[PDB]
């Protein structure tokens, strides 16, 4: 499971009842020795004032861990959803790269806010994180300039691209954010790559993320249905901006 809705808010707004809820959720998510619901009889503000020693004093068996758990929640700030762009830059898209860039550009510019964090990942014969997971506007702007300078060449090892999104969802994802993976590609895979891509996409859904596939050029509908979570999460680029704008506006509540 994942942080409950009440806990999706910044800790500073947490009620005393929220703090108790947080403790039980943590015990299950981290297999901790159960603690009394009255181990932290205070609100979020007060919890923020406690030292790590206070946590260890109140919970000798799990206080250090709970304290660190709280730090990670704080590190997400106001983020509510993380959006990962896994972009095909193979030779097949060398004459339609601007179509891919404009698609990322419009969605990025639309949803830049303290609630959103973006990552730009490109993949061909090798994968590269162009923009690490961030919600900072200046970083997002430079990331778009880097993205416009991609020279599409190579094979289509989409599993490598999805791996770079999975790793970030493990390290920085979860907690108060829902992760979405937008793979733009034509779905023309070779050899064992289809199995690798489906295996890598299986990791993504195990991390609680939803995989969307945006078909570029004459795209392989069947393949993208095996990468994405379902048939309804596979659409072409034309209208894909309006389609994704609705699903993101929806996940915003």
Numbering used by the authors: 3 to 255
Sentences from the paper on this structure:
We hypothesized that this crystal is formed by small domains with P65 symmetry packed with an offset of (a − b)/3 relative to their neighbours. The 32-axes polymers form a continuous interconnected framework, whereas the 65 helices make no contact with each other. We executed molecular replacement using both a version of the data set that included only the strongest 1/3 of the reflections and a version that included all reflections, with the strongest 1/3 of reflections having a different scale factor to the remaining 2/3 of reflections, both cut back to 1.9 Å resolution. The 32-axis chain A vWa domains make C2-symmetric ‘head-to-head’ interactions with 65-axis chain B vWa domains, burying 341 Å2 of solvent-accessible surface area. Along the length of the TELSAM polymers, the 32-axis chain C vWa domains adopt a zipper-like arrangement, with each vWa domain contacting two other chain C vWa domains from an adjacent 32-axis polymer. We have identified the phenomenon of TELSAM-polymer flipping and were able to largely correct for it by differently scaling the weak and strong reflections in our data.
